[model samples]
Target: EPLDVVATFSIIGDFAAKVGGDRIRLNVLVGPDSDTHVYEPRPADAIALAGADVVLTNGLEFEGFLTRLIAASGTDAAVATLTDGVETMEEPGGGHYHYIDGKAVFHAGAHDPHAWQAVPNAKVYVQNIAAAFCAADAEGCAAYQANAARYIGELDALDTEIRAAIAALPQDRRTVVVAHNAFRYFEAAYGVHFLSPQADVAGLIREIRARNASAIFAENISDTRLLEQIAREAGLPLAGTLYSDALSGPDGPASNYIAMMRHNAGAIAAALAAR
Candidate 1:
């Protein structure tokens, strides 16, 4: 039988299962399409954590309420931080932002906490998970390594595809407006530049209109109303949604990591072609 593992959110949960395969049984506290950044731990979550053999979470302040969740659970499970040694990025101002009360709120964190945006960094996350599992369950170390190796090969292919797709686009038309500042590492690693709005505002609609941006796109997790308005106001075609921090619904689009990357890359390429 597989070990019962608790994963904090969908992305890490998916990664965990991919790396652990049938060697581990997962209990994802945050289901598909849930955001870990703003999630609150419920009593049932504590109970679930208490039943797990190991707990997996993306650290770097991404699991904002993890400390308390662990304490409340009182589980002896090994805690694995998916981002233990990954290269971390920070917002230009060295802070995190959240939208609250119709205003852009800044949360003070030394790092950007979105390291998964970089594929190499995600490889580090996989390494961290395999290492953690090996240390905690020596008997299952071989299984973990086998599964991680296979998944990493797939990740490498996806990364190469993403870069190749971006490189295929005309260099002059590699930029597009995104709803939020989620793709910094993507731009850095893939040669695609995301022009983000100041303060995560709907006001960017008017500003992009004034500037005449060629394309505007929303994310699967964001409200498209503003992006549509921006596209209309700027007289630019609205590119389809990108898979940002989270995945899409089971039936919507980009429902998994590999699918999500391909989907976003296609959307990006199509928009540049339109421009």
Candidate 2:
């Protein structure tokens, strides 16, 4: 019988599907083109968790409703954090921005939760999921291990591609302006500068002018109008859209984790090279 698994969001759900294969019946709480940061759990979600044999969630306080949901579900399912063992980035400037409101507001967090932005961290996520699966179902351990190995190989290839792409760009041209503060790991891994807008409008304009930023990008989940205004005021060209929070719908370019990374890299590389 397949294990009943509940994944808190799409990224973790994708990992569970790839790692668990036919061995787990996966229920995803947050679906495509959805943001996980401000997700509110419902009775249906709790009901789904109640019957689950395992629950997968991204830790670092990324899912604000996780602990409550688990308690309400009353399931004794083993919960695993896929981010375990991955190196973490401290949230920059003591607070991070959220775009849920019309304006960018601050939230206090010491570590950035979007580790999967870096390919290597995603490898760690797969490994952790496989280890958890193995611990839960000894008879299916081999399958989990094999699946994880295959996924890790693909992730390794992705890392190589991203590094090569970034290496091709001139360092000065790699500076980019982004509205969402979700790409710290991407910036750290690839040596690109991801800048956020300043609270002071004039300061932001001055900073953009000083960097001679190659391109300004709006994340797929963010309001493009925000970036448009900044681009107009700063006299910087709006380069393109980057997928930061969630995958695009099935018809879109980034429908999965691997595809999302490739699309983002291609967009960033092309825009930076344009400078």
Candidate 3:
């Protein structure tokens, strides 16, 4: 065995496992159903980081506390941001759509912090993980490359499937609602529009009720209460949940990256096709 590797969160964690596989022991700092943006590092987390060979992160400021955590842990592990070469979509609306404290905070990256929504970007994440893993364990370079190639092929199928699923819905009903503004790139890539529950309620519930959205749904990783509120006030049915930012537990609907992507696309298609 080379050494232990840690992933900052579930999305990168999933990629780490795919490429690194049994060659490297993997630890996911933020496990399934957990949010990385607000994760507080504990003493154990520090100890783990200090013992790791590499730490993989999504970057794009998603894991805001990573730097301090690494520094505090006195980690010598190489921190690899999986988003290093991927293109980012600046948050749209340039206003706070998510709540923190009693007031609304404006966001420059308001569009979405969930880049995994687009599968091609996920390929980049896999490549980043492979390169990092190769550098850490040079002897496993061939295995990492081979695994990445096989995994990227599956990603290709997933990308095509999601597009086909979205195309099945009529143009008028291609839009769907999620807990957060986490689907702008998906929308841009797949022609499936995701309206934010926050934006719909920005003028408060009264205004939201008057707008005719395609469908309302919860995000698998966010607060479903907001989606429920939007659905109730908007008179739209709560169209289940979509795996937005994170995955479900190992036994849950979305345990892996491929399953998560399919679960999301399947949920969207079913919700839109229904009357």
Candidate 4:
């Protein structure tokens, strides 16, 4: 029987799918274009968790509902944290803020759970997935390792591609605004400076102009309304769309990791380069 694997969310789910191939059956609890941060686990999800032979998660509080689901399921599935060896970043100002109803809700941060934003960190995630799969189902070790190695080659090239794309832009155009703080690792990995939204609308607008951020992006996982309003207040046009926490649907542009990163870099480049 194929390994019954449960991935906590789509980004990690896509990683597992790539690493597992036909060797493991992957069940993603939080799917594409969905919000993993505010996801509420269902009874069926617990049942799936209970039946899983292995469970994949992005640790460091990425999934707030994870602990409760693990207890409710009471399953000893070999849970693997894809961020096992990832170099995590702390959120700026010790946390991130969410703008809702014109109020900023602060979510305190220590280790940023969005490590997979960096291609190098994604390489680590694939390595950990291969190791975890081997730990549970040793017979498939060779296959998983081979698959991870293949996928990692693409990752290395992806890193190069993104580097070259970003490097092509002038230094002054590197700063860009995102809806939240998820892109720090990407900023850290690459040279791009990603800024976030705030409750202090006027202050944020001034900061955007101060940084010379040409583009403000809306993520596939979050609503664009707030960002749209921010752009209007700042007198900048809405630039483009990006995928952070989740991939797009299968038919969408960023259906997988490689495509996701490629699309993001390309999108940011196109937007930033425009006068």
Candidate 3 deviation (Cα RMSD): 5.8
- Tens digits of per-residue lDDT for model 2, 1-275: 58888887777788888999999999988787764452346667877777878878777463546656677767667888877898886666777799875988877667777888999999998999988889888889999999999999999999999999999988778788887767889988996887776356577777777877788888855566777777887777877778776777888888889999999888889888886
Top candidate, metric lDDT: 4
Off by over 4 Å in 3: 35-40, 60-75, 95-111, 198-212, 220-222
Ten residues in a row with the worst lDDT in model 1? 32-41
Q: For model 4, what is the error of residue 91's alpha carbon versus the real structure, in angstroms, after optimal superposition?
A: 2.2
Per-residue lDDT for 122-156 in model 1, tens only? 78888888887877788999999988899899999
How far residue 96's Cα lies from its native spot in candidate 3, in Å, is 14
Clashing pairs in 2: none
Once model 3 is optimally superposed onto the true structure by TM-score, how far is the C-alpha of residue 263 displaced, in angstroms?
A: 0.6
Give the lDDT ranking, best first: 4, 2, 3, 1
Q: What's the residue-level lDDT of 153 in candidate 2? A: 96
Name the TM-score of candidate 2.
0.89
3 or 4, which is superior by TM-score?
A: 4
The best-first sequence of candidates by TM-score reads 2, 4, 3, 1
lDDT digits (tens) for residues 1-275 of candidate 3:
65589887777788888898779888887777765442346556776687788888777463445556677777667778887887877765565566789877756654345677799999999999899888888899999989999999999999998988888787766766666766776776787767774453756455333444557767655666776777766677776777766778988999998998898788888877873
Score candidate 3 by lDDT.
0.75
Better of 2 and 4 by TM-score: 2
